[PDB]
Structures are given as structure tokens and as C-alpha cells.
Design a protein around this ligand. Structure first.
Ligand SMILES: Nc1nc2c(c(=O)[nH]1)N[C@H]1C(S)=C(S)[C@@H](COP(=O)(O)O)O[C@H]1N2
Ligand SMILES: Nc1nc2c(c(=O)[nH]1)N[C@H]1C(S)=C(S)[C@@H](COP(=O)(O)O)O[C@H]1N2
Ligand SMILES: O=S([O-])[O-]
Ligand SMILES: O=S([O-])[O-]
Ligand code: MOM
Ligand code: MOM
Lengths: 373, 373
């Protein structure tokens, strides 16, 4: 019967948008409590039943340059390659989808602002694993590294995704084959025993339950690389959608949201502490977060907290707070917007960035609250 | 007397915002006529009098790793290093400044939409020149490559700027010491005999009339790297400005403007061809340009023309056109917005991105025209 009966159990407090397959986000109240999202609260995005993997008999398959196959046990992956730790934010393409649906309904999981989490990942460098397999530093022309998961649909197609070969081999890009998450082994929901982590790139490419790495002249031929996770114009309908026309999403644009306080809340007069997160793709650092209480007319600069990465390697979000005076018996529209190190900014409104898939939702986050007497 | 008497003569048709020092842009009607901006129309940004350089006695000074100096004539730079051609768009930080001034006056040259041009640059790779000087591929920690121009103020401080060491040494980043522009020698206004060209980065760093390259633990100590060309919050005043707080601008965000038709124009009924440019920093390709005639309510996808670069090396703008039906006796608000390969977008309005320096002006360009009876 149930194809999902072997799924792991989860922490009780989550905002679950789908039980089967399991897709949940942490309550926004907890999301920015901590710089590293605890493993139990880390948002979970599963397309399929969670694989049950016996650790000893697991083998990761890596296709070598000549068409032969290298085969790696969990123990080999731990012992043969220097462990590297990378703190990276994973964000779903559809984070903040629900705000986009308010304009015009979209297809997809109705994510609120918490389809984003941060962990310290430990594992083998993908670069080292490929050099070990025999691949050079540089292949000429345009190449991609395909990943397949152990999870498959009833008809047998695995979850798959790819990244450009150059990113796979770059020391600076920090692409990991991770077996470790916030210092413990990878939880089942997060890809036990091995997942790719692609810093600075949409979560879709961080393939969980990794069963194969292949180098190819093209992208992953899988449905989710070729006919999904792509952004379109505000005009594109379902009968006119053309996935050949847009690039697969890799790097994500600058993003931010307010996590404290929550919409509709009553706040005590005097002082309010507004908190949130901000993040940008491509290793671009968040350099500023502006916060408004008057719906986006005046702004003040927030305080930023982060782990100060080297230029071009800002893989982790910035958490932000602003403590500001609030008067008895007023309504506030709390708004936040972030600015990255290439000075990309977030757009004012959602309607002009609307799309049928509900991805890439990065317009200013607005939270309407009231102050008591 | 005149410190500017030796300045070169210019093409008569330019939009000159300053004669002394000379700062001009091409008429918007010509700007997107051609993919490569002709040398005579290429926008010109001079802080200072244009140096008069005798080609034979010119020497470029490169400080080696140990504190000695390498000295290179124009002939050596041409003969010792394989010439590399790079097609790159230079854009001023203050492009479209005048739209920002409409909200609240700013300090700076009142650029309209044409402080941007594209040329094929030929010259020595900066990377090769540094390897020749003895520098390694990688220095540990945070390093910068400083550039000084031959132009100096009356008190002797030269124009200077820097870029990160990693960009200087990257094969993929295409940083050139150029002596060639659209197939002819560099014109005086554009840096004869040698300029840096830093693809994907604000024009400020493409130091003209190059007289020195130095490698240093810090950025260029010059006024224009440390106390200018930095973006601030919509709230920052002149008495509260703090240049220690923001990153020097390097990569620029996604940008676009409508060049045809021009504001206020009358257009014949039936069909109108709207044209423009779009571009993004950091080698990020423009993947889509949306165009509106109704002030930003509905949109249609424009046709893109470009030189199809490898991923991450889209140094040149995209020109765009959309041919669309126009009805007798209506007013149109023509609006354009572009989307890059990291899916960064342009914000709706200018007020929320306002700053006292008038830089980073990338809100949607809006052109109001009428159609005749
Ligand atoms: N094998 C496999 N890997 C996968 C997925 C999946 O369904 N199967 N989901 C992808 C998507 S869409 C996202 S957003 C991230 C979510 O990872 P998390 O569950 O650790 O947050 O995993 C990616 N990797
Ligand atoms: N030596 C020198 N280099 C310089 C400048 C200058 O004043 N002196 N202006 C800088 C700025 S601000 C810009 S935008 C570009 C403009 O180059 P162009 O004149 O070729 O367009 O040159 C840069 N390089
Ligand atoms: O998260 S999915 O629905 O794009
Ligand atoms: O162009 S200047 O005035 O920033
Ligand atoms: O759907 Mo995955 O990018 O959340
Ligand atoms: O001022 Mo230079 O970036 O135009």
C-alpha cells in the first residue's frame, strides 16, 4: 500500500503544506531565532517518498571521463577526501509563493516566507571527487554535472538536477557532497547519507540521497531541470509556456522577509524589535537592509548579523534587527528590502514579477500590525 | 592659462553636460543604432584634463612582488603579450542620474540615459602582465590591484582605482590593458595609449591613460575609490554620509532604458518600433526584457539581439526591439524592465533607491508619448 509508510517522523510544530510527499517550513517565529537553523526545523522539500538507505551497502556511482565507473562507499567518501565545512543557505525557488498567489492564483506548494534555511554542511568537495575520478580542471565548451537521487516515481524516473561543470570544479564555489549537517549526520529528510550542496544556487540543484554523479555535454534530462524551476514573464499562460525559452534557475536574486512581528499582531507601545533575514545568490553579500514602518515612504537601516565570508562566497543569509519607537494606537505597515554586493535590489511590487509557476517572489515583504493604547 | 587647452576635439552632436572637464553622452537616438558604439559617440567621462602622451617615450610601470619595478613600453605591451579581444559595455555609476534628481536634487553630472557604451577592446591580458611581473596565481588573504592614470589635479593626485586581485588574475574575467578600440588605436578621450578595461564592473575602475599598476593589501587610497562611487540608503544626507559603511561599487545591477521613441514625441498610427538597451554587471546575461505601453500594467516580451557569450561572461549589452500596434489619438507610457541570468530584476520606482550621490539609478525607464489622429 502506502508508498510513504517508511518516511521519517518529524518535529510537531512545522507549517506543513503537503504530507505526501512531505513539504514543510519552520514557523516564521523560529526561523530567524538562530543563525544556523536546527536540523529539526530546517525546511523540507520532498518530491517523493524518502529513501531508506542501509549505510554499509550504499555506493555512490561516479562516471569517469572515459565511460568507466568509480564506486564510492560512505566510508571511502569520509576517509579519502579532506572534509570541508561550508555554511550555506538553501532557499526554494517558490519561497514566498503565497504572496504571488494573492495577485493571481499559481500552481505549486503554497510556501509562506520560510522555504529557506541555513546549516553548516560538512563533506567531500565535489571538485576533489571529480579530480579523483580522472576529470581535468577544465573541459572545453559547455559541460554540466548531472546528479540523480535514490528517490524515484512509481514509473522509475529519479529526481535529478545539474550544475555547470565550471561551478563543480571551482575551489571557490564550495560545492560539497555532504554527509554532515550542523555537526550531526545528515537526517533522512535532508538526504541521508549523502547530498549535493550547491552554495548560492536554488535548492532544487542540491540533490538529496545522491546515487549518481555524471559529467555530460548537456543539462540533466530530468523533468525538474528541463521542464520546471524556470522563471517567466508576467504574461505567460499554461497553454503558451515554453521551457526552451528561459534559463533553468541557478543563482537566485536578492531576497528578504520580516519574521518578527507577524501579520495582524498587536504590539506594546514604546519599543518594537523588528527582525528578519536577507540573502542573495551567487555568493553575493547582503550589504544593507532598509526597514519601513510607513509602508515604504521612509526607511531606516537595519543592524546586520552574519558570518563575514570572503568576497564572492557569501553563501549564508544575514539576520537583521531594528529596534524602533512605536506610538499608542497607530497602524504600521512594516516593510523590508535588501541590497547585495553587486547592488542588486528588490522590486516594489509583486504583480510585475508574477508568473504561473509562482517562483522568484522577491518583492518587498509587507507586514501590517497595530499598536495598543 | 587654460589647463584644458590641449584637450582633443570632439564630434559635434553630443549631449555635453560639462566642457571642462569633458563629460558627454551620445544622443539617445543613436545610442542603440549599433551594437558597437562608434569611437566618436562612445560616452566620455573625464575628471581631469586629457593627458598628451608621446607614444615612443611612454612607459607603463608595474610593481613586482618584491618591490622592484617592471617598465613596459607601448611596443613591448603589443609584442610580448598575446592580444585578446573583449567586447565590453562600460556604464557610468551615475547613468540615468537625471531621473533620480526629479525626485530630490542630487550632486553630480546630470547624465541622461546614455552614460553607457559598448566597444570591442583589444589589448594585453592584465593576468599575463602580472604573471610576467612575477606574481602568483593566488595570494592568500585579501588583495587588490591599484591603477593610476596620467591625469592629475593641480595639486598632483592622479585619478586612481582598484579591483580585487582575484578578478585581475582570472582568465575568465577578461580584464585587459587595452590599446585598441573598435579596431583602431585608443582615442585620447578614451585613454590613449593604454587603459584598463574591467568587464562587468562600473566604468570608474577602467582607469584611462594608465601610468602604474600596483598590487596591494588594500584598495586604491585615491579619493574616487575610498570617498566616492559608493551607494547609500534613501535616507542618507550630506552631513551624515559615511563611506566606511558601504562597499565601493564594483559589479553593477541589471539595467535597461528605452531609446526609441523619445519622450514627448508624436508617433504615426498603426505600428511603432520601440527600441532600447539592457545590460547587467558581473558577466550576467540579460535573459528577458519586458515592455509596457500602459504604464506597467500589461507587458510583452521584447526581441533580444546580442553576441551570445559563454555563461558568466556576458560583458556586452543586449539591444532590444518590439514592434507593436498603436491606435490613433491615444497617450502611451512606454516602460521597459530587464531580467538577468541570476534572475535579478529592476525595481518599480526611483524614490526607494534614491541617494545623495545620484548613482545606481535602475528603476523602470518610462517614456510618455502620444499617437496622432
Ligand atoms: N533527491 C532529491 N533531492 C532534492 C529534492 C527531491 O525531491 N529529491 N528536492 C530539491 C528541492 S526542490 C529543494 S528546494 C531542496 C530542499 O532540500 P531540504 O529538503 O534539505 O531543504 O532539495 C532538493 N533536492
Ligand atoms: N585616468 C582616468 N580614468 C578614468 C576616468 C578619469 O577621469 N581618469 N574616469 C573613469 C570613469 S568615472 C568612467 S565612467 C570611465 C569612462 O570611460 P570613457 O571615457 O571611455 O567612457 O573612465 C574611468 N577611467
Ligand atoms: O516548490 S515547487 O512547487 O516549485
Ligand atoms: O558621474 S559622477 O558624477 O558620479
Ligand atoms: O522547490 Mo525547491 O527549489 O524548493
Ligand atoms: O562616473 Mo563613472 O562611473 O561614470
Amino acid at each position: 500500500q502506502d508508498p510513504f509508510a517508511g518516511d521519517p517522523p518529524r518535529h510537531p510544530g512545522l507549517r506543513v503544506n503537503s504530507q505526501k510527499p512531505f513539504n514543510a517550513e519552520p514557523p516564521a517565529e523560529l526561523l530567524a531565532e538562530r543563525f544556523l537553523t536546527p536540523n529539526e526545523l530546517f525546511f523540507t522539500r520532498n518530491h517523493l517518498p524518502v529513501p531508506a538507505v542501509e549505510p554499509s551497502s550504499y555506493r555512490l556511482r561516479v562516471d569517469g571521463p572515459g565511460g568507466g565507473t568509480l564506486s564510492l562507499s560512505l566510508a571511502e567518501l569520509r576517509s579519502r577526501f579532506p572534509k570541508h565545512e561550508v555554511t550555506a543557505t538553501l532557499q526554494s525557488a517558490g519561497n514566498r509563493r503565497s504572496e504571488m498567489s494573492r495577485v493571481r492564483p499559481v500552481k505549486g506548494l503554497p510556501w509562506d516566507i520560510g522555504a529557506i534555511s541555513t546549516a553548516r554542511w560538512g563533506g567531500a568537495r565535489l571538485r576533489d571527487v571529480l579530480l579523483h575520478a580522472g576529470f581535468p580542471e577544465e573541459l572545453q565548451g559547455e559541460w554540466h554535472v548531472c546528479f540523480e537521487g535514490l528517490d524515484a516515481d512509481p514509473g522509475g524516473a529519479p529526481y535529478g538536477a545539474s550544475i555547470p561543470y565550471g561551478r563543480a570544479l571551482s575551489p571557490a564555489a564550495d560545492v560539497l557532497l555532504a554527509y554532515e549537517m550542523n555537526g550531526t549526520e545528515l537526517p533522512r529528510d535532508h538526504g541521508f547519507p549523502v547530498r549535493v550542496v550547491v552554495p548560492g544556487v536554488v535548492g532544487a540543484r542540491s540533490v538529496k540521497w545522491l546515487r549518481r554523479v555524471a559529467v555530460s555535454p548537456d543539462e540533466s534530462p530530468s523533468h525538474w531541470q528541463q521542464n520546471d524551476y524556470k522563471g517567466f514573464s508576467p504574461c505567460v499562460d499554461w497553454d503558451t509556456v515554453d521551457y526552451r525559452t528561459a534559463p533553468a534557475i541557478q543563482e537566485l536574486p536578492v531576497q528578504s522577509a520580516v519574521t518578527q512581528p507577524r501579520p495582524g499582531a498587536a504590539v506594546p507601545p514604546g519599543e518594537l524589535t523588528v527582525k528578519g533575514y536577507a540573502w542573495s545568490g551567487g555568493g553575493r553579500e547582503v550589504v544593507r537592509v532598509d526597514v519601513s514602518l510607513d509602508g515604504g515612504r521612509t526607511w531606516k537601516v537595519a543592524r546586520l548579523m552574519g558570518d563575514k565570508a570572503p568576497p564572492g562566497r557569501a553563501w549564508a543569509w544575514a539576520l537583521w534587527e531594528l529596534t524602533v519607537p512605536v506610538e499608542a494606537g497607530t497602524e504600521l505597515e512594516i516593510v523590508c528590502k535588501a541590497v547585495d554586493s553587486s547592488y542588486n535590489v528588490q522590486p516594489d511590487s509583486v504583480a510585475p514579477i508574477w508568473n504561473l509557476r509562482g517562483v522568484l517572489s522577491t518583492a518587498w515583504h509587507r507586514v501590517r500590525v497595530s499598536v495598543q493604547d
